[PDB]
Amino acid sequence: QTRTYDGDGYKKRAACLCFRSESEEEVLLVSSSRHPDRWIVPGGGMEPEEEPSVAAVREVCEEAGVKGTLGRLVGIFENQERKHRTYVYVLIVTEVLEDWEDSVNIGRKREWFKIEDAIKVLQYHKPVQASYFET
Numbered sequence: 001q002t003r004t005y006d007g008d009g010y011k012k013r014a015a016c017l018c019f020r021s022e023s024e025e026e027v028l029l030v031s032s033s034r035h036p037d038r039w040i041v042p043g044g045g046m047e048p049e050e051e052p053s054v055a056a057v058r059e060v061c062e063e064a065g066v067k068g069t070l071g072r073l074v075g076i077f078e079n080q081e082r083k084h085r086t087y088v089y090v091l092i093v094t095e096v097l098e099d100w101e102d103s104v105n106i107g108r109k110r111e112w113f114k115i116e117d118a119i120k121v122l123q124y125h126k127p128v129q130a131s132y133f134e135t
């Protein structure tokens, strides 16, 4: 996959907060490839000329094996340490697929979390991802 960058050299990413329902009480996290006992928000790099909302949906299909109704842009989040900029969308999950690309290819796991518990497991390694939930 070709990595893309903003004019200031930050890597362009898109991600979804993948909720079980329109009540947005439970969210899907996925395991880190580099560190499988860590949870992250599914998302990843935008391809050349790829709209952020398209990249967001593609990446959560690839990583989390879900599909659903794309909701609002929550915001654009910089990670100054890692020099990336992430567009973060709400996705209401309508389809949970059992044998998805990163499960098959790299053994990636997924799990539902209550919002408060998602914030807790992201805080240590992924504080910017915890902040996606601050509304």
Ligand SMILES: O=C(N[C@@H]1[C@@H](OP(=O)(O)O)[C@H](OP(=O)(O)O)[C@H](OP(=O)(O)O)[C@H](OP(=O)(O)O)[C@H]1OP(=O)(O)O)C(F)(F)P(=O)(O)O
Pocket: 003, 011, 013, 031, 032, 033, 034, 035, 040, 043, 044, 045, 082, 084
């Ligand atoms: O390696 C790092 N983060 C990498 C992602 O790993 P995690 O964010 O899951 O820890 C990795 O995601 P996976 O391949 O593990 O799913 C992918 O992030 P992305 O593909 O979601 O963007 C990759 O980016 P690439 O190297 O561009 O693939 C990221 O590295 P940085 O983009 O340098 O943070 C890190 F920042 F150095 P760490 O301190 O988290 O180890």
